[PDB]
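Fold this complex.
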Amino acid sequence: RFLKVKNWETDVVLTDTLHLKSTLETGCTEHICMGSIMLPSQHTRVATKDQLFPLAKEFLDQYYSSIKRFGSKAHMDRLEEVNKEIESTSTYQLKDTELIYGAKHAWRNASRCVGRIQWSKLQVFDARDCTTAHGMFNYICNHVKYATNKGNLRSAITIFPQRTDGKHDFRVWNSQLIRYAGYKQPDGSTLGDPANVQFTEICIQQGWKAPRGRFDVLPLLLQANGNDPELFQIPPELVLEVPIRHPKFDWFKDLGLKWYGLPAVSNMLLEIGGLEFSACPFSGWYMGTEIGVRDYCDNSRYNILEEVAKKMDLDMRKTSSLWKDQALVEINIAVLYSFQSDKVTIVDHHSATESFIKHMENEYRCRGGCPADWVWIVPPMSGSITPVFHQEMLNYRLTPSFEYQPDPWNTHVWK
Amino acid sequence: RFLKVKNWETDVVLTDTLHLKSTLETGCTEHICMGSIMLPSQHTRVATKDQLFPLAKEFLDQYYSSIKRFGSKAHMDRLEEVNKEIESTSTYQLKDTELIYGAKHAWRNASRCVGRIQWSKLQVFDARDCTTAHGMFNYICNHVKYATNKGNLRSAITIFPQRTDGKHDFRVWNSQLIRYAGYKQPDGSTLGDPANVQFTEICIQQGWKAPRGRFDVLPLLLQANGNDPELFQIPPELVLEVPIRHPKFDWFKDLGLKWYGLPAVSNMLLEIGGLEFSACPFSGWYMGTEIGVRDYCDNSRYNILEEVAKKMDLDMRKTSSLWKDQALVEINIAVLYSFQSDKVTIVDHHSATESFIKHMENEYRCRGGCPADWVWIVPPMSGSITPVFHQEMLNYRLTPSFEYQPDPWNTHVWK
Ligand code: HEM
Ligand code: HEM
Ligand SMILES: C[C@H](O)[C@H](O)[C@H]1CNc2nc(N)[nH]c(=O)c2N1
Ligand SMILES: C[C@H](O)[C@H](O)[C@H]1CNc2nc(N)[nH]c(=O)c2N1
Ligand SMILES: Cc1cc(N)nc(C#CCN2CC(F)(F)C2)c1
Ligand SMILES: Cc1cc(N)nc(C#CCN2CC(F)(F)C2)c1
Ligand SMILES: [Zn+2]
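Structure:
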């Protein structure tokens, strides 16, 4: 019942008891493993009043058995206080300290995040008093400015009012606070980011005048209390960008690449003691491979392997010349070199994966485990020369948690 | 119940119904996914007479509903014939055609093997009349000669007598038919392959005179009908080796690397209609990354990244210089280039993973699915620039199957 996970490069063994506390389901059964399914039903997110108190009680018991005040009067009266308020309101409200705890532990419990060694250093911005989409823009601007810190990136999350009935929902329609626009050409090809071709069309549909270039920062589409969303442009002095150059190849500058400094996910859902926060933008800093491998070299994204292979002068006729691999490594050296020379926080996949193994060590000692998703933790290049490749990992779903949710434009009852 | 798997690079969707036929268990539960555990209990392998007929019946029903002769007289009489013989003997014997079918479908069902597009082109060598360890050596030599085919590698498997009581067991003690010896130095470091340091000691323990160099081909340790195993040296003209050189870097020859052409796994167990074949060496051809990434660059194997980085003249002080990544790509270009120039069959990880996607297509059409283990299918370098990275895969255990088994020297009752 008390499972073991092995590291096959060092022979370290760790014992996991934290999985006992797991509540949610994974998708796998005794006869089928769905560990490679991207969005199983369980990882996506309507609740009723009856189900709310056990989830509150369970969460309150975690928080008071955290500040080592479990079962005492301060715990019991808060237990009864929330109980009474769930009877009275069919919902409840978190204390500011409970919100900060719940949000840090959602990140802590994110099994697909290799960055969690930082989970306790998270700045939490309480935006539950927000009522309008202008208010949201203002809070989101303050988040971007704080988290960027002129390149000394700081982790942060901003938390808008929780879902109540469901038809009144705060939502950030962008998938990330800062993304580049996707424009499809009249012939068929794509300028900018093909991922956002659909979102770019919704913004033009709502009034955005597109500068139709490559790296056009998208406006924000903010929806408040269920109302229709409104467009706002992030003041460009708040959007820190890094021009990508190589430390050997001087043709690399003329490639004309740049990325943004701040990775800030805005389309997910924060769940805390049964409450649902449909708009909770959170940001950290990049691991290099996110830009250099996935953003730049995915076939359905920017897809630059061939142009980089061209200017490197490469054997591009054969697949076994490994020209794709060779050009991929140079692109990622340039991503790292550019962010570092500009003093914009970035981490390479060797540093990040070492830290995660060190984070797993700590989590099995002082916590009894660390839910981890190997499929997402192992970086998308050079997998087996990083220590996470050889580390067995148990995946399981703890709460508080970040979850996926459907896009707002498939569900919003317009008017 | 009839699950869907998505490809996130092409948007192809496939429907899996084959998982319904699954019998064995995976290790995962509704509340925990063990998709990254290397050797769960279910993937390792004693049976009694009562359990044997449903497994025979189930297997016979697959084979006759294969040559489109299901339920007929030829099926029913073989059903009753095996039934009677399980009553009479508490076991049974496969027809030669049933053995060839069962072995091809064990490979077909191997969810961790990216090579299965070839599953029906498998040469099956029936060695069930073998009685002595000399006999085994002779059969294993004929396998090596056939499968190598002077560099035009051909897939093959040799099948020794099935387990009966358990204390009489044919076993190949080597983990692969051809491996290099592992010698630990008096100071502590290691020459050759550190993986086989333990096995190398068992061979010296039994009489092997070690040439104590780097790439010393190990003798065979063959155990027949439970007797103690005996050493035999594969005639060196039967062991095809490829010296590793680079097509640009002429210092690469002086690195002094070579590998063997034939990957031939000998420590696993073939299960067919309930029968257990404890010695079933099977061979194919290499995917380049097996040698170039894992064999050469694993920290606990040959571990050559630093010496290759040295001669490349690399920024080795920092982790973020990606010198490890850069030297890894060159090692794999050289592995491919050397095998190809010598006309020894090899496949690169781009060709192999494309073929597997094409194999999955066929399997979902004419079979209803294809059990696949993403953790093992995705290659250990450049993962996301190969199409398997973006393909969702359902893992489940079908029979006939290859399974792991404990090492013989932890279980053999000596004398
Ligand atoms: C501090 C620096 C951080 C680093 C280096 C980091 C690293 C990463 C990386 C590389 C991914 C994979 C993204 C992808 O493949 O698309 C990821 C996923 C994720 N990260 Fe972190 N992250 C950081 C901060 C944070 C913060 C502050 C939070 C939450 C407050 C967070 C929560 C998540 C979640 C929820 C996911 C993916 C969840 C899913 O897909 O189910 N991360 N992280
Ligand atoms: C024909 C050329 C073949 C290629 C290119 C190929 C490719 C591969 C590769 C790269 C692996 C991973 C090995 C590792 O990471 O250590 C693998 C695993 C495997 N292959 Fe194939 N293979 C081939 C032939 C075969 C044959 C002929 C069989 C059986 C008769 C087979 C059965 C297996 C099994 C059972 C495993 C791993 C099972 C496990 O660990 O549970 N392969 N294959
Ligand atoms: C099919 C597969 O699950 C999918 O491509 C996953 C694989 N692992 C990943 N891992 C990370 N970190 N990010 C991703 O987008 C993905 N994609
Ligand atoms: C911990 C992890 O399961 C282990 O390192 C696995 C990962 N995937 C692998 N995949 C292949 N093909 N071969 C391996 O040896 C491994 N090792
Ligand atoms: C906070 C954070 C840090 C980081 N280093 N990266 C990301 C990211 C991302 C984008 N992907 C799509 C997703 F699944 F939402 C995450 C987010
Ligand atoms: C037939 C075959 C083909 C191939 N291309 N590779 C292998 C291999 C290997 C060694 N690994 C350890 C294992 F799990 F047994 C497989 C085997
Ligand atoms: Zn699973």
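The CA atoms of residues 113 and 377 of chain A lie 7 Å apart.
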